[PDB]
């Protein structure tokens, strides 16, 4: 079991988009105060991930990366490859040198 | 027409402004916490129950959180426990022995703690059926509902009989040091040697060394099993086992433990004419073999059935074959002709299981499971078991050889795991069969379909030129009756015997005698040597000593018959039911998967209704399956008297 990773199984409210919740507060599932410790109606929201080589395909540790793109008043910075063609000379052609 | 709800701080303002409230507009006052509905020329007070103190934390929310937390951790603990058991089952080693010792200790202590935690979550205030059912399984204390001393002594007595049954050995009088265990020393000699004397001595010696020793232990085991059954709100330990089949709170599908007994008795009573014909013909073949040892009217000998408990008559199939000159159906020699192994057996099993429309299963099981004994460096168990290790890990323990018998058991084993991962969407508690008679039924139905000659011809196991005459069909049907129908009366009665043994209706000084009386009138089998109540022959069963309910086998047989009939109806099979094959029928697999995915969350009665169409079990598939054999037995019973006689005995 690869227990390095943890998942916030429980939370007091739904996280807002593009928000990270890292607080390790003992989740209170009931009306009994947790007092900083788990127990009756008190558990740990950041439960442990268990990954083994013989686990199920949908249960394997999957590395997921999401690439959000931000366009704002600031100048654009992350542009595309902008492939360039070959070069010709002494021929009537339609050229484009950086716009 | 639309309206809404109106509020007022005080009822004085409500009375003044009630004239302006249109009909259909609700009037609420916070001072009196009273609700009213605006009606024609007035307002009608809405009846309100006791005011709750805003219990925003119900037990349902706490139970759901506790269940989810339990299921997440229980998955890991059970997973590593299953790995260690598989490692031991594939390699028996001293380091492996302590592995389940630690794994079982942690799992048991963890289970009792979660059961203890679930104790303060009563099911009365829980409305979710899944939550209520899962916590009911969690709150099942079992042996711990009583005091610790009662649990400790019950476990010690359970360990004693389990060890005694495992080490049950009998020695020949002439050779004191020459002794044979029940498995396989005793079983091999009685199943192979047809000698009356040797089988009688082995039967008598086994019940003398084991029956006498386990009689006080079984009675103490039964007494303690009645002690925590009533502590678990059951009239006997038999009712405790029957609680699994009980369905409560499901309108239109509720089932009671008493209903199971009545339906099982009703099924056996209508089955009886078919069994009597089979018993008569098997008896008729017995005078053919031994004319001076079996009466034409008397019951069959206990040791002359192929099983010392009288379970299966498969060993008698050669002795009771309808036609001994017609060769039997077997394509094992064709497998070695095509150079096949256990890997090809499982590979063809998957090909059959995807021909029925169900999707192919992953590659993890193939590389994580052995299909042949791992040489001799590491000792492994070859018993047919299914490993529901969890976390999407599934394994099969089988030293499968290139044989038809191993081919069918391999089909049986993959059907078990194919049932296991079908309901993977269920939580950890609900990732199980609906009843104990369903997992074996799933593996049995399609293994028989694989064994059908049409399946063998389709994938080349049997040559297409094979002729399908009634002679081979009758021989196959009789073998099915001996192996399947033959064990039904023994399965029904022994569970019936053990039920009232827990109930205490039949006194201790009559149990075995009532068993033998039931062996004669009901089973139609008579013991060859008279004994006393010191003998505890029903306790000589593996399941009785190892605390296993025996009703699983009789229920599974009728469950699998219903499943096979529904499979043939879905496949629109024409002709004899025993030749019905589900291969190359995608719709049949889809219909089966409709309940395979369902799991144990729904009542098993609903699952049975979804498969065939009847909420209650029925024996209709039995008649359709064995109709050619039933007519053949009726025709051949010109000398086979239908039934048996209680009066006659091998010793009397």
Structure description:
The structure is cut from a larger assembly and holds chains A (99 residues) and B (652 residues). Chain A has 99 residues and is low in regular secondary structure. Chain A has strands at residues 6-8, 27-28, 42-43, 46-48. Chain A is elongated and about 85 Å long. The termini of chain A are far apart. Chain B is α/β, with parallel strands linked by helices. Helices cover 53% and strands 6% of the residues of chain B. Chain B contains 25 helices and 10 strands. Chain B has helices spanning 11-17, 59-90, 94-119, 129-138, 148-166, 182-192, 196-209, 211-231, 237-242, 257-289, 332-337, 342-355, 364-368, 404-420, 439-451, 453-458, 470-485, 487-503, 511-523, 542-545, 551-571, 586-596, 604-611, 620-625, 627-636; strands at residues 5-8, 26-29, 34-39, 42-46, 169-171, 179-181, 300-301, 385-390, 393-397, 525-526. A 4-stranded mixed β-sheet of chain B has the order 1-2-3-4. A two-stranded antiparallel ribbon of chain B has the order 5-6. In chain B, strands 7-10 form a two-stranded parallel sheet. In chain B, α10 (257-289) packs across α25 (627-636). Chain B is globular. The interface between A and B is medium-sized, with 20 and 26 residues.
Compile the SSE list and pairings.
This is part of a larger assembly, with chains A (about 100 residues) and B (about 650 residues).
Chain A: E1 6-8, E2 27-28, E3 42-43, E4 46-48
Antiparallel strand pairs in A: 1-4, 2-3
Chain B: E1 5-8, H1 11-17, E2 26-29, E3 34-39, E4 42-46, H2 59-90, H3 94-119, H4 129-138, H5 148-166, E5 169-171, E6 179-181, H6 182-192, H7 196-209, H8 211-231, H9 237-242, H10 257-289, E7 300-301, H11 332-337, H12 342-355, H13 364-368, E8 385-390, E9 393-397, H14 404-420, H15 439-451, H16 453-458, H17 470-485, H18 487-503, H19 511-523, E10 525-526, H20 542-545, H21 551-571, H22 586-596, H23 604-611, H24 620-625, H25 627-636
Parallel strand pairs in B: 1-2, 7-10
Antiparallel strand pairs in B: 2-3, 3-4, 5-6, 8-9
Helix pairs in contact in B: 2-3, 5-8, 6-7, 10-18, 10-25, 12-14, 14-15, 15-21, 18-19, 18-21, 21-22
